[PDB]
Design a binder for this molecule. Structure first.
Ligand SMILES: CC1=CC(=O)c2ccccc2C1=O
Ligand SMILES: CC1=CC(=O)c2ccccc2C1=O
Ligand code: FCO
Ligand code: FCO
Ligand code: F3S
Ligand code: F3S
Ligand code: F3S
Ligand code: F3S
Ligand code: F3S
Ligand code: F3S
Ligand SMILES: [Mg+2]
Ligand SMILES: [Mg+2]
Ligand code: 3NI
Ligand code: 3NI
Lengths: 513, 322, 322, 513
């Protein structure tokens, strides 16, 4: 059965999913990003800092992430100096946006599918409906409402969220005051207490972060009623009951560009020094092995994308030349997503899944420096049960406690008397690479400044990595492979497709930009 | 009141801003104010054919559509086909045609929907336009003479993104029987939000008054106004951004970021051409090319010279201190 | 951090304002920031001897007192006995003497505690004074040289009442290891709140700039600045009232009420003498007796004349429209 | 046993209570208001509108009520015109302050005493502790936190709360916009939903307002689990279990000056037309009979108060001449409270209890006009079980649903294009009477303007009515008589005294001003 699902909403943009179904299982899948705005085209010729305005408008939910990496793209292009406070503020705001994204996505975009009638037979279904039904769910409402709190912190430093551009080469535009920081701490602490610990975890962030193995997590669920009936404990039990741990595996290979710089280690942003300075470590996990991320290995294929092109392009030489979808479909193109691929030695240019799971895998790599996220939990989970909708979601949710603690510490690290901005030299020429871990994964800008104008500007967003179509080798993108193998109980409401696409927290406006 | 919220060439920033609503928050708005959100690409439960059934019922009049909210641009490329924005089996613009013609009220939320916004920046690859405007030029996709069934033009809730209150309070107004209290300016923006300027309530107006410029970002923004060195469009931008604070905390200009004038139909102003980003374009190095709304260069500069002379000492010092 | 909050000649408005705290709210402050509120007349559970036991233990050093918050005046009448304020078996001023000498930090919250405030208005029947100030005159009840055990003078959180943030954020600062970030102005007010003016962020500053006066209350306040006809002390008053909005909504001056200058030690200014309430005292009918801080009448009036001439049309029209 | 309790906190100011106890029962009581500021003295000679600034500073919790009646005192003194919108805004803000006071007082001041160890034997004690323990109580925290919401509405119209003076002769200073009203509605609706209906009632305000008899209220508690376990249902059951319905009866005579004017009926405030224009009806209930309130009948006795004076004074001729408490105690004076008495025909100058219960009794008077509160509930409750701590508290809590509905309607009544202010003539001479129902009851200003200055200014606050000492006839004040008959299980923690004093929501800073 060929099934074309349109729209597959709650992926922050326009997505159609075509699947071939045999015996109630997806055997092939096509993700079709359906809406193109062309920001890379628009940015050509604009002011070198136009990206700080334009790139946040790639996405409303992860615009702050776009701002972060666009700023660092300029910071690297212009060889700027970043005062530690600016790095801290950038870290805080990037993390705060993600902390907003985590519950907002989980409740408003993902968990309402847990109420699907396919699960009516589950003993947990009534509770799932009570908790996660859209708008009226008892977990939905506070989860969604409180998700605005972390971006209040963003607004304290950036003026507003979404839609600030306050991250500029050389630092940030703002100059936090004491009451800014104390309020940011208060907002974060309240949000942590009222959503993260009370509703999501039913325990302290510290207790959750003590989970180092999958068995730890299972013990955590059963440890006491609070954790058992928390949103996290319920979600795990629900997943294990309804089978969300049994599909959505995907590529099993992961890309994290990392984000969050240790302020002392990235005071002078360079492409080369980027990895060592990261707190949230970059890392490529492929064929069960850890590799260092190197932006030079990134290519974008447009073979099945609605763009002209005959070879994968590293984004520094990237091009965004749309073809009419009517013509492109005649050439087998089916998506406005480019196909980002990553050259892994011995594997060729492979699709890599990006996102929290990729980050958690990267965080389990050996040889973490002291400032760096060193977390074996998802190495263990990956080996124990492998990837799945549940594991992917747990990776996302796992970042809530981890990022909250980082933000809380970064807020304490702010030295309010110290500089937040070093006026950079706006060089007429420059090649910049900025990358961050948006909520959804590796988010990267490759910018070429020439003659005090944007010569090239190539954004590769995490969902582009995940949802980008087949490459020249016909290798399915991560979400496409994750969709393959998914059961389809009801072709009329193929919620499992939604589960898989949304387990990546897919953002289609970011996918295409 | 049924609400159908569609996204064309959107980044979903207006939805994300909208979800930051407080008083009412979005859940209480959707649930407790009698506003039946039929579907929203970011929030609607229905997918695939169940979603399209909702859309077609609204488009064909099978079920009432009281408020059609459109976010993002009306993408007309390629070649007027709109296929750079294929939604639910149609070019989004065709949905827009049908749903705007079906709704009692059409709300464009965000510059993209209102005026074309960033995607309509040259070279405008997506052939983006606003619902009833292309930038300042009235017309846009629906034409200058479009009226919803309640007789209103597209209500333009501009911004990039719109502040949640700019739409939620309008929705509350519509839900509480105060639609007749909603007046729209010449750009169809609610005057209750868009008679003020961004500058209105900016914490730097005293510096503006005394022509004391912020000189640098970061700690440089502990003093001064952003108008002179950072291209703040605050005095030329109609918004309540410093009356109704963003995220109940701040605003661009309070934080030290120049107002980009995003509530104005020309946004991004000057199409982010080189030299115009976070910079004040000046004539002869001292005269701003653009002076505050309703002023002229001669009287503005004259008053500015006098203000510079009268400037008290505190206006020359840090005020947003640690 | 133990906190003992006492009330002398108070109206409890600072407590009530404090209870409006958000981010943090008062419960999260009391519970989740490690601030052990030993007792508060409006909130403490203990009464009678159980309460006095808490007080005496703090007064005598049996248990540590980290923050002594005093609200309301130090009532010294009659005849210096303080018996117009008998609290827990003593004149409140004696408690103040003991607890201020015991605390690591002493916070006067509200003008009453800071400067004597309204009860210290003539004829001051209660012999009210502030902790370390009587109006502008440094000294008050504790003397100019009083220092808490952390070496600080009384921290003056002025206002009538103080905005909750003016104390909660200081409490958060003290609780999060940022006490060293707290700088105090010459009145011992936290400069993080009291370097700005009430006018800073007022929605009427543009009207102030162009010398466009609000002429009447009610709908008259849809335009204009309150400085000229309603005695707004905004430009002479250090506060963040228009930076950090009251009740997360508004401020006096935004709403159309003149700033009374309540954060300043002279409040109520002119002791509410006839003709000074909601009126601008003027010389020769046109010159304000008091000009904005740091300005002089000559340059202020000169600039005002120029501003009046340069004034754009919108500054002469309603802006806070329905 | 003579027991002197000092301090008896959580009465918004300085209160000492002396009681004589015989066989574990209070047989006589003295309330000692212990702190004097002398605002009536200060106001003499000040600008006629100084009261609008000074009187709110009588009290932080009911300053808005002081502002309301101070404004109307000027409105009557100056024969002003009140545009209906101004009346509406005044009504809204007065009611919003009360809506804030109701939960803030109930949880923070009153209900934490329900956790007293005297109740450890009650089967509901653990739940009472879970719900109402100070700061950590599960009802305490949201109750107290959400109590800030109604005064956000106040701030929307008045600029701030507390401490606005935006109610001026001729209207209000503010000019609400559309977003002001819509936000006010949203805030109110959220507060109603999240505290009043969800936490307090466990049902709709409408369902609660259907309770017309005491039996209705008892049926309401038992009707379903939501109402049974609501804060209201629990409080009633707790009161009936621990005996809060068995003492704190008090005078059984009541004074309501009323407040909330029907805008069309008080466009030209006069003393004489005041009663007819009231929505929240005035009314004196004494010896089981209804009387019309008449400010002329009010006197203040200082026989046992620390003031000079030899005869009860109507406040228009009032005087506030402090005596040294050392001297006054030698003359049997014991309180800074004056003793307000009310001339009821056939009863002489009697103490009248003020507060919600007084209002609810007044609301049960016959011949209510269409605009007027007509509610038989507390006539029935009074006849069924009589006054008590529980009934007094229920009267207070009963106003939450009633006032919420009024405010919601008043917000709808606002005609935003219409005037909010009619510039009055500031007459050099004038006698003004302003009165409102502050949260705690009849709050009244008698002002005499002479020579464009305040000649006399006499405030009589509700707790002055309630807590004022014995008059010249040695007749105990309402709280004093309410204390008499109270059991005293533990003289070391005489919580029942606290229950009784706090059941009046006593405000000692208002008492003395
Ligand atoms: C001409 C001019 C000079 C300034 O320094 C200045 C500073 C701040 C705002 C505006 C101005 C301005 O217009
Ligand atoms: C002299 C003068 C005249 C005004 O009209 C005016 C209006 C608004 C604010 C200030 C002023 C002012 O100072
Ligand atoms: N998170 C996020 Fe948006 C995506 N994909 C980016 O970058
Ligand atoms: N409520 C209240 Fe305050 C008292 N008593 C007044 O008036
Ligand atoms: S927020 Fe986004 S939807 Fe358009 S208006 Fe701005 S780019
Ligand atoms: S007053 Fe503010 S709005 Fe801009 S022009 Fe100056 S920073
Ligand atoms: S850029 Fe837009 S959001 Fe406000 S501060 Fe300027 S109108
Ligand atoms: S609020 Fe009250 S306690 Fe004093 S400072 Fe003002 S009169
Ligand atoms: S600008 Fe505002 S602070 Fe007062 S002086 Fe004018 S109303
Ligand atoms: S009176 Fe006070 S509260 Fe602010 S607006 Fe003026 S400093
Ligand atoms: Mg790209
Ligand atoms: Mg009095
Ligand atoms: Ni995105
Ligand atoms: Ni009071």
């Amino acid at each position: 059965l060929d099934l074309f699902v349109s729209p597959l909403g709650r992926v922050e943009g326009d997505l159609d999913v075509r699947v071939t179904i045999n015996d109630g299982v997806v055997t092939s899948a096509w993700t079709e990003a359906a809406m193109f705005r062309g920001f890379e085209i628009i940015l050509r010729g604009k002011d070198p800092q136009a990206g700080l305005i334009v790139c946040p408008r790639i996405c409303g939910i992860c615009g702050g992430s776009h701002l972060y990496k666009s700023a660092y793209a300029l910071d690297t292009a212009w060889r700027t100096h970043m005062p530690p406070n600016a790095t801290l503020i950038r870290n805080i705001c990037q993390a705060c946006e993600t902390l907003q994204s985590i519950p907002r996505y989980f409740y408003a975009l993902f968990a309402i599918d847990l109420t699907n009638k396919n699960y009516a037979k589950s003993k947990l279904y009534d509770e799932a409906v009570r908790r996660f039904a859209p708008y009226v769910g008892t977990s939905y409402q506070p989860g969604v409402v409180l998700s605005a709190k972390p971006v209040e912190v963003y607004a304290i430093f950036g003026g507003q969220w979404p839609x600030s551009s306050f991250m500029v080469p050389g630092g940030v535009m703002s100059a936090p005051t004491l009451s800014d920081v104390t309020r940011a701490i208060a907002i974060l602490e309240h949000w942590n207490d009222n959503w993260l610990e009370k509703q999501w975890l039913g325990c302290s962030v510290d207790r959750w972060l003590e989970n180092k193995t999958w068995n730890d997590v299972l013990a955590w669920v059963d440890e006491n009623e609070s954790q058992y009936n928390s949103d996290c404990g319920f979600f795990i039990r629900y997943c294990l009951d309804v089978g969300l741990d049994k599909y959505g595996q995907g590529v099993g290979n992961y890309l994290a560009t990392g984000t969050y710089f240790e302020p002392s280690l990235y005071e002078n942003p360079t492409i080369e020094g980027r990895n060592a300075a990261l707190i949230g470590r970059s890392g490529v996990f492929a064929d069960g092995r850890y590799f260092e991320f190197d932006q030079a290995n990134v290519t974008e294929d447009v073979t099945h994308s609605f763009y002209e092109g005959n070879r994968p392009l590293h984004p520094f030489e990237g091009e965004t030349i749309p073809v009419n979808p009517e013509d492109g479909r005649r050439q087998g193109k089916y998506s406005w997503a480019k196909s980002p691929r990553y050259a892994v030695p011995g594997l060729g240019n492979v699709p890599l899944e990006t996102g929290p799971l990729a980050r958690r895998m990267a965080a389990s790599a050996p040889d973490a420096e002291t400032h760096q996220d060193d977390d074996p939990l998802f190495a263990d989970i990956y080996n124990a049960i492998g990837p799945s909708v549940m594991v992917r979601q747990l990776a996302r949710m796992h970042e809530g406690p981890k990022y909250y603690k980082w933000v809380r510490q970064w807020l304490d690290d702010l030295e309010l008397k110290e500089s937040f901005y070093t006026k950079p030299v706006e060089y007429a020429e420059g090649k910049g690479f900025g990358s961050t871990e948006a909520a959804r994964g590796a988010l990267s800008d490759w910018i070429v400044i020439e003659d005090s104008k944007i010569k090239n500007y190539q954004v590769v967003t995490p969902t582009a990595w995940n949802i980008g179509p087949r490459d020249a080798s016909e290798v399915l993108g991560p979400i496409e492979q994750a969709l393959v193998g998914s059961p389809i109980v009801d072709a009329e409401d193929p919620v499992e497709l939604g589960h898989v696409a949304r387990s990546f927290d897919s953002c289609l406006v970011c996918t295409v930009h | 009141a049924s609400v159908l919220w569609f996204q064309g060439g959107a980044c979903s920033g207006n939805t994300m801003s909208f979800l930051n609503a407080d008083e009412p928050n979005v859940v209480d708005l959707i649930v407790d104010f009698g506003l039946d959100l039929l579907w929203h690409p970011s929030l609607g439960l229905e997918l695939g054919n169940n979603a399209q059934k909702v859309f077609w019922d609204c488009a064909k009049g099978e079920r009432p559509l009281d408020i059609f909210v459109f976010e993002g641009t009306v993408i007309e490329a390629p070649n007027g086909t709109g296929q750079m924005d294929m939604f639910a089996g149609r070019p989004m613009k065709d949905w827009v045609t049908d749903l705007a013609g079906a709704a009692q009220i059409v709300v464009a939320i965000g510059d993209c929907a209102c005026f074309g916004g960033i995607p309509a920046m040259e070279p405008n690859p997506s052939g983006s336009t606003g619902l009833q405007f292309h930038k300042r030029e009235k017309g846009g996709f629906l034409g200058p003479d479009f009226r919803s069934k309640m007789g209103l033009p597209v209500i333009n809730v501009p911004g990039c993104p719109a502040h949640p209150d700019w739409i939620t309070q309008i929705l509350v107004a519509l839900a509480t029987g105060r639609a007749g209290d909603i007046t729209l300016d010449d750009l169809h923006r609610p005057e209750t939000f868009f008679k003020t300027f961004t500058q209105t309530g900016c914490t730097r107006v005293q510096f503006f008054e005394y022509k004391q410029s912020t000189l640098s970002f970061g700690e440089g923004t502990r003093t001064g106004c952003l108008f002179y060195e950072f291209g703040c469009r605050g005095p030329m931008t109609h918004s309540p951004c410093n009356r109704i604070l963003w995220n109940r905390q701040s605003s661009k200009t309070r934080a030290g970021m120049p107002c980009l004038g995003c509530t104005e139909p020309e946004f991004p102003h000057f199409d982010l051409a080189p030299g115009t980003v976070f910079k004040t374009q000046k004539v002869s190095g001292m005269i701003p090319k653009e002076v505050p709304e309703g002023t002229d260069h001669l009287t503005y500069m004259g008053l500015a010279a006098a203000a510079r002379i009268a400037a008290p000492q505190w206006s020359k010092e840090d005020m947003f201190v640690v």
